[PDB]
Each structure stands twice: as C-alpha cells, then as structure tokens.
Amino acid sequence: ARGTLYIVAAPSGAGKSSIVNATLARDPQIALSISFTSRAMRPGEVNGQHYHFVSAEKFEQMIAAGDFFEHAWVHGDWKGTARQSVEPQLAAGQDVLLEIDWQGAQQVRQLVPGTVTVFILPPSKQALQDRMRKRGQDSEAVIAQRLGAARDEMLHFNEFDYVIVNEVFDTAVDELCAIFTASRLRREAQKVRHAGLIQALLTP
Amino acid sequence: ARGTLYIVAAPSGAGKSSIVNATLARDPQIALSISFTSRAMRPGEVNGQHYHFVSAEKFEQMIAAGDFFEHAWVHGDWKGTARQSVEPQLAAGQDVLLEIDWQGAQQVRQLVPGTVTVFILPPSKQALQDRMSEAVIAQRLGAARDEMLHFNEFDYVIVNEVFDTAVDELCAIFTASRLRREAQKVRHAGLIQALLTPD
Ligand SMILES: Nc1nc2c(ncn2[C@@H]2O[C@H](COP(=O)(O)O)[C@@H](O)[C@H]2O)c(=O)[nH]1
Numbered sequence: 001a002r003g004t005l006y007i008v009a010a011p012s013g014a015g016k017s018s019i020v021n022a023t024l025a026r027d028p029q030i031a032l033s034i035s036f037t038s039r040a041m042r043p044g045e046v047n048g049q050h051y052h053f054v055s056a057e058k059f060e061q062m063i064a065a066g067d068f069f070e071h072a073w074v075h076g077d078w079k080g081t082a083r084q085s086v087e088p089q090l091a092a093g094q095d096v097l098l099e100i101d102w103q104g105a106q107q108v109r110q111l112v113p114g115t116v117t118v119f120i121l122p123p124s125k126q127a128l129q130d131r132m133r134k135r136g137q138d139s140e141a142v143i144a145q146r147l148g149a150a151r152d153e154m155l156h157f158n159e160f161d162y163v164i165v166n167e168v169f170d171t172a173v174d175e176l177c178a179i180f181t182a183s184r185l186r187r188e189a190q191k192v193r194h195a196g197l198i199q200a201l202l203t204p
Numbered sequence: 205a206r207g208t209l210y211i212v213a214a215p216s217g218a219g220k221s222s223i224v225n226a227t228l229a230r231d232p233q234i235a236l237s238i239s240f241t242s243r244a245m246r247p248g249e250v251n252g253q254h255y256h257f258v259s260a261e262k263f264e265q266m267i268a269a270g271d272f273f274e275h276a277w278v279h280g281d282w283k284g285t286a287r288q289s290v291e292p293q294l295a296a297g298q299d300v301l302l303e304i305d306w307q308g309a310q311q312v313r314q315l316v317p318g319t320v321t322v323f324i325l326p327p328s329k330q331a332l333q334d335r336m337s338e339a340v341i342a343q344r345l346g347a348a349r350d351e352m353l354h355f356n357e358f359d360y361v362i363v364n365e366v367f368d369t370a371v372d373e374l375c376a377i378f379t380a381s382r383l384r385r386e387a388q389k390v391r392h393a394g395l396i397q398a399l400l401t402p403d
C-alpha cells in the first residue's frame with residue numbers, strides 16, 4: 001500500500017519547521033524530506049540539515065537531468081524536492097512530508113492527487129518580524145524584503161486543505177497531529193488497511 | 205463561524221455509543237442531538253434522554269409540518285432529527301453531533317455543506333456476534349450487516365479495536381474538521397486580511 005504525501009506550507013518565520021519537527025517526533029511514521037536550494041546559506045543553517053545547499057549551476061544541472069520531483073524559483077533562487085527523496089519512499093509505503101511553497105505544492109498536487117496539504121499562518125505580521133531577528137542579524141532592507149516575500153506566499157493560502165494559525169505552539173502541534181491522524185482514517189485509506197475485516201463483516 | 209455538523213453512525217454492537225459519550229466528555233463544545241421517535245417506550249425508559257418519544261400521529265404531524273431536518277423509517281418505526289435541535293445551535297457557532305442511520309446521513313449530506321460523517325466498525329465478526337433467542341439474534345445481526353453495507357458513504361471509518369484509541373481518533377476527526385480552509389477563512393477573516401495587505 002502506497003504511502004501518503006503531506007505538504008505543510010508557511011512563510012519562513014511563521015514557525016512551521018518547529019511545528020513539523022515536534023509533530024513528527026510524536027508521529028514517527030511520517031518521514032521528512034530535505035530540500036535542495038541554490039540560495040546562499042543564512043547564519044545558523046547547516047548544509048545537509050536544513051537544506052542541501054548547492055550552486056545554481058549544479059541545481060540547474062539537476063533540473064536538466066530530471067532529478068527533481070518538483071522544483072520552483074522561490075524568491076529569486078532555486079528550491080527543489082529530489083525525486084530520490086519522495087517517489088521511492090511513497091512507492092515503498094513510506095509516508096512523506098514536504099515543506100514547500102505554493103508553486104511546489106501545485107506541481108505536487110498534479111503529480112499525486114490525494115496529497116494532504118496544510119498552510120500555517122503567523123498570528124500577526126509582527127510575529128513574522130520577531131522570529132526573523134531572533135534567527136540572525138538581518139538588515140532592515142533584508143527584513144523588509146523577506147516580509148514582502150512572506151506575504152506573496154500567504155496570498156496562495158486558499159489552495160490548501162487545512163489552515164493552522166500558530167498562536168500557541170503546543171496547540172498548533174496538537175492540531176497538525178490531528179490532521180495527520182484524521183487523514184489515516186479517511187474511507188479510501190481504511191478500505192485498504194482493513195480490507196479483510198470489511199470483507200468478513202459484509203459477508204452474509 | 206458556524207458550528208460544524210458531525211454524523212456518527214454504526215451498527216448495534218460496535219460500541220459507537222460509548223465512544224461518542226467519551227468523546228463528548230473530552231470536547232464540551234459539541235452538543236449531542238436528541239432524536240424524535242415514534243417507537244413505543246419500554247418500561248423504565250425516560251422520555252427526553254435517549255429519545256423524545258412521541259406518538260406515530262405526532263411524528264407524522266411533524267413530517268407534514270416540515271419540522272424534521274432529517275427523518276427516516278428505521279427498523280419499523282419513525283426516527284428523526286428535529287430542525288430546532290440543529291439549525292439554531294449551528295447558527296450560534298456550536299458543533300452538533302447526530303447519531304442517525306445511513307438513510308438520515310444521506311439526507312444531511314445533501315443539505316448542509318461541511319457535514320462530517322463517521323462510521324464505526326466492530327473489530328471482528330466475532331466481536332459483533334458476542335455483543336449481540338436465536339431468531340432475534342440472527343435478526344439483529346442481519347440488521348447490522350445491512351447497516352454496515354453503507355460504510356462506503358461515510359467520510360471517515362473507525363475500527364473500534366482499542367477503546368481509548370477509538371476515542372482519540374474520533375477527537376482527531378473533530379479537531380481536524382475545524383481546521384478546514386473554509387471554516388478558518390471565516391474564523392480568521394480579520395487576521396487573513398491584515399496578513400495579505402501590503403505596507
Ligand atoms: N518549491 C519548493 N519550495 C521550497 C522547498 N524547500 C523550501 N521551500 C520553500 O521556500 C520558501 C522559502 O524558504 P526559505 O528560503 O526562507 O528557507 C518557504 O516557503 C519554503 O517552504 C522545496 O523543496 N521546493
């Protein structure tokens with residue numbers, strides 16, 4: 001039985017990665033994917049942990065080679081989910097969670113129909129600024145640019161099945177866990193998981 | 205934000221009632237709806253607890269008056285959800301849970317947009333038989349299979365193997381359903397407008 005594909009999107013600085021990491025620790029049957037990006041490393045980021053950082057030429061080499069399940073030009077740099085991070089896992093029955101923008105989510109929706117997609121909103125525009133200057137010394141000009149890029153991402157929230165507002169951290173984690181739990185209870189998934197039981201109950 | 209309408213159906217002997225009651229204890233923002241029925245009261249039954257018991261003539265008067273949100277002929281008697289048990293609560297932002305048969309669930313799905321329907325199955329054929337005179341027992345098992353044949357009409361399916369897990373799963377369904385986009389667009393309309401407006 002194929003794994004379920006999950007998408008959790010949010011502008012950076014809304015706290016999605018902390019929510020996802022806490023959610024997966026509680027629900028370990030879902031694997032996280034590490035994206036590729038040609039954007040420059042920001043302070044505090046670790047290559048091979050937050051992203052696989054590569055050159056633009058290497059990334060475009062990987063585009064041309066067909067290495068990406070989805071990829072997109074995100075805020076003036078390449079971002080991408082490697083084919084090897086998703087397609088074999090899903091084919092092997094492993095659930096996979098992608099943290100990608102709306103452009104990537106749209107490509108994934110056309111590739112995998114039943115993807116479960118969640119958007120996480122910050123509790124205010126101010127909340128975005130606060131989390132950004134606690135991740136590293138960014139200039140006012142860069143903070144203004146990233147805030148603008150955040151609004152651009154949030155304009156596409158309506159494309160997602162669920163919306164979580166990250167007001168209380170432990171509550172947002174509970175809510176993302178409820179969404180993941182509920183998705184395994186959907187009729188079509190349960191028909192597969194309990195096919196034998198259903199056959200027994202409906203037999204005369 | 206309007207309340208959500210939830211439907212939980214199951215054959216007899218699947219344990220649905222205990223799961224629903226335990227779920228309501230955990231989630232007090234959910235009102236349970238008391239159905240009307242024309243079935244005769246058994247000695248000791250309390251009108252207004254499990255049902256609002258009325259005469260068949262009164263039930264049929266309510267059909268004719270359009271008073272029922274949904275109603276059906278269930279196991280040889282009338283059963284019905286009165287409009288007044290649903291529409292005011294939902295309009296006041298209170299979630300409402302209906303315990304009705306598959307015939308009723310079909311009517312509600314067509315009427316109310318975001319209706320969430322859940323079907324609960326026993327963990328095995330033996331477990332169903334155990335929970336249940338040979339002809340009466342066979343009759344009740346036959347009614348159970350007829351009910352379970354319609355599980356495919358429901359959005360979610362819970363197999364009641366472990367009780368506390370079944371309650372967690374029902375709670376997860378209620379929680380997740382409130383996070384659905386269209387509900388959140390209403391609930392957070394002001395926040396969304398601010399976030400999407402430029403400087
Ligand atoms: N399409 C796509 N977007 C990604 C990928 N990885 C991260 N992003 C998204 O790019 C945006 C910018 O993230 P940041 O550059 O601040 O780390 C975020 O919305 C993030 O989720 C990816 O693999 N594909």
Ligand SMILES: Nc1nc2c(ncn2[C@@H]2O[C@H](COP(=O)(O)O)[C@@H](O)[C@H]2O)c(=O)[nH]1
Nearest residue numbers: 239240275276278283284285303304305308
């Ligand atoms: N359509 C409909 N079915 C109901 C209603 N209340 C109970 N039922 C159904 O009637 C059947 C018998 O319920 P009982 O009274 O025997 O516990 C169950 O399948 C239950 O779902 C109602 O308001 N409407």
